[PDB]
Design a binder for this molecule. Structure first.
Ligand SMILES: CC(=O)N[C@@H]1[C@@H](O)[C@@H](F)[C@@](OP(=O)(O)OC[C@H]2O[C@@H](n3ccc(N)nc3=O)[C@H](O)[C@@H]2O)(C(=O)O)O[C@H]1[C@H](O)[C@H](O)CO
Ligand SMILES: [Ca+2]
Length: 474
């Protein structure tokens, strides 16, 4: 009989990998290890060992080391071929002040802790909170933001970490709209350090704002030519040979020209359906990606439990509440206050009026059938949330602190969603969006002005709503 087993593994510099036969007996008539490629490193004594330690050296570049074990018994020959590649350590750096990028990043971190258990992670998130215990579970060190952006504390921590290593790969994960505020402060001081490589950049939309910006930019003359022309502008700024930075889209959608970059779009098809963005679609090419909504469900049960704990969402309870009554489920999305100089109570009352219209079968804006009522208040709603919830005795509360985007991520969207406009509507399937209410703002003071706004024009183009779904409350 002959058995041949093969495997490969990355070994981080200075870490240990145990070479051992794969699925073989513990004892042999004869046996040997030999090294078949890579700089000689096998010790003479280990040739007759069954298992022994490979300690990864510190190198100027990655290198593969190949080892073959041969073991013979009376009726069976066992061969194990193991290829070890010595790699630089990887530091993963996460920066976000919103919700959606942080939530996507958290899923990635949970996966990556299992796939890359040696990697250190530095995390600066404004909305998602990782406590000390969960942080240790995920090899996370948390750092504050400076306002909304990368802190000097984080920059110095990365500098120190880099200094401590023979070589370093850095992976960045951040918010697409604010990439230029977050990455250059880290990239610039490391730029001339040849042992440090920015190995990957992952950029995530945070919501509607990236689409409004694209909408406002789509008719700009010669816009891709201008983008191309600003690549060197970004490059020289990062290299610290010029103080001039690209303005606008040039500091946002040129990263893939300089680094291995993925742009995760919440609605990648916007680049398809909006004809004046076909040129940007082509310019980004394979770097443009669709943000996935189903990765949570592919996590293991224990991993799902960890995600839920960190984001503060009792999914099991909401599942139970959805099933309390056999009616389909409606979530009203609340807001805070808006323009007009009215009292807090006025803003709560207007939202109560909206719900009353929604559940009134004689109203033109009736949801269309009977639903069980659920309330997702704005996190900053305060007493407004209490007033609204208290106005509907059988309405079930979904804790306002939870980012609404957690529901779409965990496949916990209800049958229908309606209420005050928010970025959260950009990640709800059209079939689940009932109506959206726009309130008085500096740019919107009636329904006609709402319909003509960039935000609504984008949602119409994307099919999130039709005009009949767009409502106004002063
Ligand atoms: C153009 C403009 O002024 N945009 C602002 C925006 O800069 C920000 F100020 C905010 O952002 P807004 O997208 O409403 O909400 C931000 C985040 O809050 C959470 N959320 C909100 C409501 C809710 N019922 N459950 C939730 O969970 C979601 O995570 C969401 O992504 C805000 O008040 O924080 O309000 C909007 C608009 O003034 C508002 O949308 C008009 O209705
Ligand atoms: Ca129900």
């Amino acid at each position: 009989k002959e058995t041949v087993s093969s495997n490969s593994a990355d070994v981080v510099e200075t870490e240990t990998y145990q070479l051992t036969p794969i699925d073989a007996p513990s004892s042999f008539l004869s046996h040997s290890w030999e090294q078949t490629c890579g700089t000689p490193i096998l010790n003479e004594s280990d040739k007759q060992a069954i298992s022994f330690d490979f300690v990864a050296p510190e190198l100027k570049q990655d290198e593969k080391y190949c080892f073959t074990f041969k073991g013979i018994t009376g009726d069976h020959r066992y061969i194990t071929n193991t290829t070890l590649t010595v790699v630089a350590p990887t530091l993963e750096v996460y920066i976000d002040h919103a919700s959606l990028p942080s939530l996507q990043q958290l899923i990635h971190i949970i996966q990556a802790k299992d796939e890359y258990p040696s990697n250190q992670r530095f995390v600066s998130w404004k909305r998602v909170t990782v406590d000390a215990d969960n942080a240790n579970k995920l090899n996370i060190h948390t750092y504050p933001l400076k306002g909304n952006n990368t802190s000097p504390e984080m920059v110095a921590a990365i500098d120190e970490y880099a200094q401590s290593k023979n070589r370093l790969n850095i992976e960045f994960y951040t918010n697409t709209a604010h990439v230029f505020n977050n990455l250059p402060p880290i990239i610039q001081p490391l730029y001339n350090n040849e042992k440090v490589k920015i190995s990957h950049i992952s950029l995530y939309d945070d919501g509607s704002s990236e689409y409004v910006s694209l909408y406002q930019w789509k008719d700009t003359p010669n816009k891709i030519e201008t983008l191309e022309g600003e690549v060197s502008l970004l490059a020289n700024y990062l290299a610290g040979t010029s103080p001039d930075a690209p303005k606008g889209m040039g500091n946002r959608y040129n990263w893939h020209k300089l680094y291995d970059t993925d742009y995760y779009f919440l609605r990648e098809d916007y680049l398809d359906v909006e004809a004046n963005l076909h040129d940007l679609r082509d310019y980004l090419g394979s770097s443009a990606k669709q943000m996935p909504w189903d990765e949570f469900a592919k996590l293991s049960d224990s991993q799902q439990t960890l995600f839920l704990d960190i984001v503060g969402f009792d999914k099991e309870q909401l599942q139970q509440q959805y099933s309390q009554s056999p009616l389909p489920n409606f979530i009203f999305t609340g807001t805070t206050t808006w323009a007009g100089g009215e009292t807090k109570e006025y803003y709560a009352q207007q939202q109560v009026n909206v719900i009353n219209n929604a559940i009134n079968e004689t109203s033109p804006y009736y949801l269309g059938k009977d639903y069980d009522l659920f309330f997702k208040g704005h996190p900053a709603g305060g007493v407004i949330n209490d007033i609204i919830l208290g106005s509907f005795p059988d309405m079930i509360n979904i804790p306002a602190k939870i980012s609404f985007e957690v529901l779409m991520m965990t496949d916990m969207l209800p049958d229908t969603v309606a209420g005050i406009a928010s970025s959260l509507y950009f990640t709800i399937p059209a079939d689940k969006v009932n109506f959206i209410v726009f309130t008085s703002s500096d740019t919107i003071t009636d329904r006609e002005e709402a319909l003509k706004s960039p935000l609504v024009q984008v949602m119409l183009t994307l099919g999130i709503v039709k005009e009949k779904d767009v409502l106004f409350w002063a």
